[PDB]
Design a binder for this molecule. Structure first.
Ligand SMILES: Nc1ncnc2c1ncn2[C@@H]1O[C@H](COP(=O)(O)OP(=O)(O)O)[C@@H](O)[C@H]1O
Ligand SMILES: Nc1ncnc2c1ncn2[C@@H]1O[C@H](COP(=O)(O)OP(=O)(O)O)[C@@H](O)[C@H]1O
Ligand SMILES: Nc1ncnc2c1ncn2[C@@H]1O[C@H](COP(=O)(O)OP(=O)(O)O)[C@@H](O)[C@H]1O
Ligand SMILES: Nc1ncnc2c1ncn2[C@@H]1O[C@H](COP(=O)(O)OP(=O)(O)O)[C@@H](O)[C@H]1O
Ligand SMILES: Nc1ncnc2c1ncn2[C@@H]1O[C@H](COP(=O)(O)OP(=O)(O)O)[C@@H](O)[C@H]1O
Ligand SMILES: Nc1ncnc2c1ncn2[C@@H]1O[C@H](COP(=O)(O)OP(=O)(O)O)[C@@H](O)[C@H]1O
Lengths: 152, 152, 152, 152, 152, 152
């Protein structure tokens, strides 16, 4: 899908509580990605169980779903060339301990259960999570004036 | 009322296009205010005309309304003591020329017809603007861990 | 006297707790002031009522002493031309509501009882506060390479 | 001349030595002004005597000219609506002591003889200083892609 | 050779348009390198074709050359120990996708055909590129006060 | 042990002199580590050769001791899960040439003898260095409100 690829990102409850929302948004803005959906939300455990359905057998599954519902998250959709892969690169490893300085988690986090943010792991997960969290009318198309200075 | 006062803020289309959303959000976060609503919307002229109803007869009203409808805006509700009056101070004068460095308009723009942000001018205006832009179930109540170090 | 004037500054418990120590220090560093003493302490109530002796008969005095004692404070001494008066300008007005953006309290604080920093109000108060918080041996003399570019 | 107004700015030798060139440039970029000339230069005392000709009777004139020639300056031309007036607002008062936090001098400087930067005091001085420091071919015209988000 | 090694750097037209000049300059300043030449130029295709002579037969050569000529570039010479190799590390991989967060390309862009900066690839290349872009009298020798705290 | 592991960090004389203390502190603060001791000192040569005891027979040992004694150092103790190993990752490789951008030395330093910071290399070295630089009464215990958002 080229430069029209989209990913689902969410600032987790710890990110909101630590006042790192603007700090997170800025990292993706300064990179050149296009913000196309944004929402402050109180995620229900039902949505979170489906969001993390792949992890249902894991010992930390219950804790994860409860933590993600214990406070507001900032749900987001970002657009650009390799946005899924590259957003993951900017996030850093799942475990902050393996994430180098320079990444969100390397700069801001200690522990895997309190990493600040979610990013889709693949284009298939992205497509699944976009539809899960957002309605079609919540996804905005806009002509970026500086697009020519990011692409070609 | 009190620490429970709320204000309506909006990053205008130039804020999104100039990649200043994270920059704007960060400044209210670090000030100590609570983010209680957030969404990226593409506003109709109809909404904006109601939003700026009092400016109906102004020579610049057409330009304002079109400009606000020209791109996505980030709609926000912030909560805290004296948040309406204080957010306006953070934003700076309507004309960025009269807005001192240190303010959002002082640091980040030039002209009155492109001043990167809207803020409610009073508690009564905030009350009308919140209801106009948000459904009541888009306004989130959450226990902020940071209020302990901001309030007596 | 002159370029060798000194002030006492302290990051209050809310400053440490909100992780704003580095931020505060950076602002005095980038200004070109010379750091001559620095220390993390749990100041005893006995020390704090002598520090705030002049506010004895104020209603808030009691809970101001108890608060400043309720956590670690970063005590420091800064040196430079007009440091006392210039520090207070940088810190901002006592009530953060009166403190403009660009100042520490204008950027970071909401309420008077949680204004993340103390600064000596006069040259004479500075001499007194410096002597009360530090021993003579804690105040360091060091050749300031940067001085040749900050002074005529 | 509207949005086509230009001003001459120079990072003084102290600004270069303190590594504040990028920091200075950033303040004018983030404001929305257009950089149209840029040059690292070793200013001769002959050029500096003419640059500051208005000050020839002043007791500090010799010292000023010698300081300005003791190291490289970053000579610049910036363009935009009220760029002369507004650049001065961003610089802050001549004497750093009268310049509030938020301005270059308020944030970064102590003493009048070591203020970090020069800005034209008027459009007439701007026109004089542009021609003094730059040849016509050193002034570049470029179409700013985000111009529509700064003007109208 | 030694601390006297020099490299040619250029902020490409996208760096100027995305207002990242001050951001780029700040990163070499804070690393400890000495700025010895600086100018904003509008490069001819002829200069750029010589600059990228080795890429003459590449399928993207036309696009590169036109893009580089499409807007003003900031030409620079930086000086310091291992400055060529180290600047390249600061810049990051040619393709911004392979450039880790923390690098200029890692933080600030997406695509290989719009990577905001050029850096010499070797001491021999730097020598050719400096002579190509600068006259010898545009290269400044100045006694840096900061070298004392960067070098043994 | 665990979340209560502690490391010793020191801003070396070049760190203080280059006004990078606030910068360094901020980076450990934003990471979520807890500051438990802090102090500006002129460390005696006798202390420094016992601190660097293990490097006795190294050629540089002599001038390393004398350098670290030639100016004020900011001694500190930080606390958190895996703080020792994570601090060293944040600081970067001993030779800044091997230290990637995003790390402290990768961002700020050029040469091995002027790498602006020391950090304990192991848990056992930390216990030893902490005890050597601080008295038991200088290491503070305080309730970390932020901990509930950094740990599971
Ligand atoms: N071992 C664990 N203990 C507690 N929480 C975990 C653990 N592993 C993962 N998590 C949480 O669950 C989220 C989803 O895990 P996973 O899908 O493996 O990683 P990612 O978010 O990188 O795709 C993580 O981002 C993290 O917040
Ligand atoms: N004279 C003008 N010319 C063009 N646009 C204007 C003018 N005055 C105001 N505006 C636009 O209309 C908005 C609303 O105006 P107003 O309510 O007076 O200011 P504020 O938003 O600061 O309360 C302003 O923020 C600005 O975007
Ligand atoms: N009305 C008040 N209520 C609560 N605390 C106050 C009040 N006024 C002052 N304080 C506290 O007492 C401290 C010292 O008071 P004062 O000397 O008046 O201000 P400053 O610290 O700006 O010099 C202030 O920093 C503030 O935290
Ligand atoms: N009293 C003084 N002593 C030393 N240097 C001064 C003094 N006054 C001004 N200067 C230097 O001379 C420059 C030019 O002075 P002036 O034209 O009055 O101010 P400005 O630069 O604000 O236009 C100042 O920016 C400053 O660097
Ligand atoms: N495959 C490509 N497609 C488009 N542009 C490219 C490609 N490879 C390189 N370029 C452009 O040409 C410039 C010079 O290429 P090269 O010398 O290989 O890299 P570097 O500039 O990192 O030394 C690159 O910085 C980039 O702007
Ligand atoms: N080859 C060298 N030349 C000069 N100084 C050195 C050299 N190697 C190490 N040092 C200095 O000695 C300090 C301690 O050395 P070491 O323990 O090897 O590194 P680190 O401090 O990263 O653990 C370093 O921080 C550095 O300043």
């Amino acid at each position: 899908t080229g430069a029209h690829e989209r990913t689902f990102l969410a600032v987790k409850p710890d990110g909101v509580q630590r006042r790192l929302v603007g700090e997170i948004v800025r990292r993706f803005e300064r990179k050149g990605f296009k913000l196309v959906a944004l929402k402050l939300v109180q995620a229900s455990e039902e949505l979170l169980r489906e969001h993390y359905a792949e992890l249902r057998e894991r010992p930390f599954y219950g804790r994860l779903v409860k933590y993600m519902a214990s406070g507001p998250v900032v749900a987001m959709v970002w657009q650009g060339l390799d946005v899924v892969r590259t957003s993951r690169a900017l996030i850093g490893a799942t475990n902050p301990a393996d994430a180098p300085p320079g990444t969100i988690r390397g700069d801001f986090c200690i522990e895997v259960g309190k990493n600040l943010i979610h990013g889709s792991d693949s284009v298939e997960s992205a497509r699944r999570e976009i539809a899960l969290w957002f309605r079609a009318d919540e996804l905005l198309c806009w002509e970026d004036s500086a697009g020519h200075w990011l692409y070609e």
